[PDB]
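Section handout, structural biology tutorial.
Before the tutorial, make sure you can parse a SMILES string by hand: atoms, branches in parentheses, ring closures as digits. In the record below the ligand is chloride ion, and the chain has 124 residues. In the tutorial you will relate the predicted structure tokens back to the input. Do not try to memorize them.
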Amino acid sequence: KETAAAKFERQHMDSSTSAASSSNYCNQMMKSRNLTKDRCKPVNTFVHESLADVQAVCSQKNVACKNGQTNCYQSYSTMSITDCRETGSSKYPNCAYKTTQANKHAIVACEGNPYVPVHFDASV
Ligand SMILES: [Cl-]
Ligand SMILES: [Cl-]
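Predicted structure of the complex:
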């Protein structure tokens, strides 16, 4: 079993790099974080900030989530973010992703005590 907090860290946290290096970034990252083990994760986002900074977003701007839940938070400043999406020629187990790097505000859902990110809603 894996806690929600831990799953968010695995799926969305990447403080090792300051941004998406190349176009293959999303390919090897979706792999190293085990997001291609049993299925190709269609869409996934990586935040290139310190965990501390991402966790802090749980105390930033409270916004609604796409699903309507009122526990989403948007970061006051922009963050280095990498979006990963399957390309047209992506088929399990040969997943292929388009890596798109940018700096936008991250929006996550927080819950529990300690109150930390447990899901990544979107990035604006
Ligand atoms: Cl995501
Ligand atoms: Cl600060």
